[PDB]
Amino acid sequence: EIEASEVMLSTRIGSGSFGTVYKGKWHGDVAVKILKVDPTPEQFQAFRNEVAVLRKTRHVNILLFMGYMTLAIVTQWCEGSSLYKHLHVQETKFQMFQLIDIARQTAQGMDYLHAKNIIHRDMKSNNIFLHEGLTVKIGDFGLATVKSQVEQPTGSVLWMAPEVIRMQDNNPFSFQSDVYSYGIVLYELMTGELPYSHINNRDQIIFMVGRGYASPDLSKLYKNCPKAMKRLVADCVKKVKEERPLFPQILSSIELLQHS
Amino acid sequence: LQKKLEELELDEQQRKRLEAFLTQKQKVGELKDDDFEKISELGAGNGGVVFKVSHKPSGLVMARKLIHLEIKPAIRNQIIRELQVLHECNSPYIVGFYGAFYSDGEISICMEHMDGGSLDQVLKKAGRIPEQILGKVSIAVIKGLTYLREKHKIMHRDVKPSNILVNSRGEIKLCDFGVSGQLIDAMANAFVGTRSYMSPERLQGTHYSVQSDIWSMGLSLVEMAVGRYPIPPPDAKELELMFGCPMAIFELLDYIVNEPPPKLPSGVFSLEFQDFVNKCLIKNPAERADLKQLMVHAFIKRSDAEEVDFAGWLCSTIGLNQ
Ligand SMILES: CNS(=O)(=O)Nc1nccc(Cc2c(C)c3ccc(Oc4ncccc4F)cc3oc2=O)c1F
Ligand SMILES: Nc1ncnc2c1ncn2[C@@H]1O[C@H](COP(=O)(O)OP(=O)(O)NP(=O)(O)O)[C@@H](O)[C@H]1O
Ligand SMILES: Nc1ncnc2c1ncn2[C@@H]1O[C@H](COP(=O)(O)OP(=O)(O)NP(=O)(O)O)[C@@H](O)[C@H]1O
Ligand SMILES: [Mg+2]
Ligand SMILES: [Mg+2]
Ligand code: NI
């Protein structure tokens, strides 16, 4: 646990699906998320156990996790813009090989998290940052105790796996559900757009994706997107989760097409 | 604008109130972020948050909604331009509009302050809303939907208790309707909710119209009549446990599409009211009643002739001084 005295909350950045981000100082530049959760005592222990796991993570494509405060979490501050802003706001000029490289580094960070037995639960371009140019940084991974217990979906609809939408079983979260969310990030990279651009109804998206009536339009992938990368997007967003590849195979496929 | 008032069929007091509001809009020029002084929060939701503010140049009390969106600057400017149509949406059943601007990554929508809040907030205090009050609510929603259809050729798209506002003068007005096509598209990228008032045909992605808003009104009327979101329907024991002797989001959507619609309990409500919401909740939009048929329904014809002190009921319920 971090002492609130040493935390110097500076400016407010914004709020997401489970907290409000502030820039701060704690032995250096730090990011602080005031969680929207009065927690139950059973949840507070599950939170402290998750923090012990997330604090030990060490990878170049993963944002550092510092600790908690009293509820709030302290993470590594990133001065770059999120991938969502690069693709959908600023429209940053990206080469095709640069888009593949962003996909590769994101698969490396996800492969590290899964090899450390950590499910992201909320993989999307909003939680990917470009650090000092073209170094991917993944944030907001895990935190199932503070994002949600109640067996109800939480997060952005567009990246949510169909079995996570349905919540038929109490735990629809797996490595494969992260792969679907990663596949939607691939769709963002290889189209420059969000999925379901013809559907402007959030509840319609939840229902049709849950029933399998709606899937990302793969005809909108860039024409110069390689066939192997096109197949990778289709494999990651398979409706049946048992047909999706895992990140060891995803990373190898990217490394194969990258070295041509 | 004052000429467009003559095209509406209003009583004399409704015309005076609209003419007065149009006069106050003249005291409003460009809207900047530094011209507002916060007074209090009014509520929050999925898209954004709402404040009661004071516009220092004009001195007018306004409700300022802030919607946070990460969009291209061209989409943002197109949203601000499309919201200007609200300057011409003047009706006793539509919430007034003052202006829209962008700042701090937030699109601000400044609108008429309704000191009674939403019917969602009123329901949380009243527990249930009487049938005679819901008769006036139904008339206001039908006439507001009719105004948007005839005068602006648009539908609401988000009818629900939180988007029906009331005030201490007894007025009932609609808000948060889809006037900006770019704002509808941008807000489709949203977080998952916990309940829905969406019609079955819009969930399935087939053809839709104002008939979908009629469904949402019917579902909203049942919720306020029984004091509970009516999906899934309550038990017969739960009915007596509410009038006197939890599903996840996808499961709710599947229920709306594949299961019979909810209905009012018999006995505690008039047969006219029960039939009224039944015709609103017919799942096939072609069999569902339309705005013309609802206005001449027996429930509306009786409610329209009733003398109901709605402002006094609000005052006695939420403490809103007239
Ligand atoms: C769930 N149904 S849905 O999926 O179709 N989503 C959507 N539904 C409906 C609309 C929209 C977008 C929208 C919003 C939310 C909006 C909010 C306030 C507003 O200000 C005033 N409003 C009325 C009177 C006076 C005003 F000052 C204008 C607005 O204009 C808009 O267009 C949606 F995204
Ligand atoms: N570690 C960080 N460093 C810098 N900015 C951050 C960091 N984490 C979040 N932000 C920013 O803070 C704002 C809100 O963050 P956040 O609460 O994560 O919203 P979100 O990521 O879009 N939705 P979600 O992460 O699912 O809750 C956004 O502008 C983010 O870019
Ligand atoms: N013009 C207004 N005058 C007074 N109160 C208002 C006004 N507009 C909104 N409010 C209040 O502010 C609250 C927040 O509204 P809003 O941000 O639209 O979320 P919501 O409609 O209530 N729920 P959701 O649509 O799911 O986000 C509403 O519930 C009202 O109680
Ligand atoms: Mg985030
Ligand atoms: Mg609203
Ligand atoms: Ni390589």
DSSP B51-78: EEEEETTTTEEEEEEEEE----HHHHHH
Indicate whether A60 and A116 sit together in one domain.
Answer: no
Q: Amino acid identity, residue A12?
A: R
Scan for tokens 């105004």, then name that residue: B147
Q: Domain holding A23: CATH number?
A: 3.30.200.20
**Method for structure elucidation:** X-ray
| Residues whose CB is less than 8 angstroms from the CB of residue A133 and which lie 6 or more positions away in sequence, other chains included | none
Residue A162: C-alpha distances to residues A157, A236, B218 (Å):
10, 12, 30
Token pair, residue B233, equals 């329907």
Three-state DSSP at B223 gives: helix
Indicate if A32 and A144 belong to the same structural domain.
no
A149: distance to nearest CA of chain B, Å? 13
Give dist(CA A1, CA A3) in Å, integer: 7
A183 and A203 inside one domain: yes
The CATH number of the domain where A216 resides is what? Answer: 1.10.510.10
- Residue B183 Cβ inside 6 Å of ligand 1? The answer reads yes
A206: nearest CA in chain B? Answer: B250
Nearest by CB to A153, from B190, B192, B203: name it.
Answer: B192
What are the residue ranges of helices labelled H in B163-235?
181-188, 200-204, 210-226
Reduced DSSP (H G I as helix, E B as strand, rest coil) percent helix, strand, coil of chain A, to 5: 45, 15, 40
Say if residues A235 and A77 touch (Cβ distance below 8 Å). Answer: no
Q: What residues in A contact B184, CB-CB < 8 Å?
A: 200
Which residues have beta carbons under 5 A from ligand 4 (an ion)? A 16, 127, 140
Report chain A's terminal Cα–Cα distance, integer Å. 48
Domains and CATH numbers, chain B: 2-112 (3.30.200.20), 119-318 (1.10.510.10)
Rg of the Cα trace of chain A?
18
- Whether residue A44 is found in the same domain as residue A127: no
Count of structural domains within chain A:
2
Paired residues of A131 in beta bridges: A135
Q: Is there a single domain that holds both residue A123 and residue A20? A: no
Best mutation target, A140, A158, A184, A201, to test chain B (most B CBs within 10 A): A201
Which amino acid type is present at position A119?
A: I
Residues A109 and A149 in one domain: yes
Number of alpha carbons in the 13 Å side-chain half-sphere of residue B82: 17
Examine the domain organization and report whether A225 and A157 are in the same domain.
yes
**Ordered alpha helix ranges (H), A13-82:** 41-55
Instruction: For B208, list phi and psi in degrees, rounded to 5.
Output: -145, 165
Domain's final residue, options A46, A76, A106:
A76
Instruction: Tell which of A43, A59, A76 closes a domain.
Output: A76
Verify whether the Cβ–Cβ distance B253 to A14 is below 8 Å: no
Q: Tell whether ligand 3 has an atom less than 6 A from the beta carbon of residue B121.
A: yes
Instruction: Give strand pairing partners of B266.
Output: B269
Same domain, A107 and A186: yes
- Check: CB of residue B19 under 8 Å from CB of residue B90: no
**B72 to chain A, minimum CA–CA distance in Å?**
4
Q: Considering only CA atoms, which of B244, B285, B11 is closest in space to residue B155?
A: B285
My answer on whether A28 and A108 are in the same domain is: no
Say if the Cβ atoms of B202 and A203 lie within 8 Å.
yes
- For A131, the domain range is 83-258
Q: Where is the binding site, in residues of B?
A: 42-50, 65, 111-114, 118-121, 160-163, 176-179
Please confirm, yes or no, whether A122 is among the known catalytic residues: yes
- The helix (run of H) or strand (run of E) holding residue A14 is strand A12-15
Domain boundary among A76, A103, A129: A76
Bridge partner list, B97: B111
Q: Which helix (H) or strand (E) holds B138?
A: helix B131-152
State whether A87 and A113 are in the same domain.
yes
- Do A106 and A185 belong to one domain? yes
Give helix B181-188 / helix B73-82 axis angle, nearest 10°: 130
